[PDB]
Design a protein around this ligand. Structure first.
Ligand SMILES: C[C@H](CCC(=O)O)[C@H]1CC[C@H]2[C@@H]3CC[C@@H]4C[C@H](O)CC[C@]4(C)[C@H]3C[C@H](O)[C@]12C
Length: 124
């Protein structure tokens, strides 16, 4: 089962888990054979182990994450605008991505795509 209210809740849980460095909580949102794609290095992580390794690397620094607009959710997809704030290269940094989730019929994320460019990196 997969509704727009459920997909919105999942986006909220994802943001909350990033904020809490809750690695198990992040990975639990994904299907066993899900893909995560990140535009920065143009890499695709397929399946639980690769996804967990990606988020473990991504949590090495404490993250402050928040939605900056309403989630867009319909049928089997959700997209959202947000910020990730952290200390990097000795300065506070804010990255403003848009992510897209596709869900399977069971309400698990089967595909994730994260998109941000150089112009979406901001000093603190
Ligand atoms: C985890 C978020 C967002 C994940 C998502 O898009 O949903 C992303 C957004 C910005 C990303 C960081 C930007 C700077 C760094 C780039 C490195 O080469 C890998 C580690 C760092 C520290 C990255 C870690 C991680 O990948 C972040 C914090």
């Amino acid at each position: 089962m997969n509704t727009p209210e459920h997909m919105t809740a999942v986006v909220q849980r994802y943001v909350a888990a990033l904020n809490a460095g809750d690695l198990d909580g992040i990975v639990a949102l994904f299907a066993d054979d899900a893909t995560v794609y990140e535009t920065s290095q143009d890499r695709t992580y397929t399946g639980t182990a690769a996804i967990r390794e990606f988020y473990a690397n991504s949590l090495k620094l404490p993250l402050a994450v928040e939605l900056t607009q309403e989630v867009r959710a319909n049928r089997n997809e959700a997209a959202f605008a947000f910020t990730v704030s952290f200390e990097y290269q000795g300065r506070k940094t804010v990255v403003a991505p848009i992510d897209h989730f596709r869900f399977n019929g069971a309400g698990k994320v089967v595909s994730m795509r994260a998109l941000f460019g150089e112009k979406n990196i901001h000093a603190g």
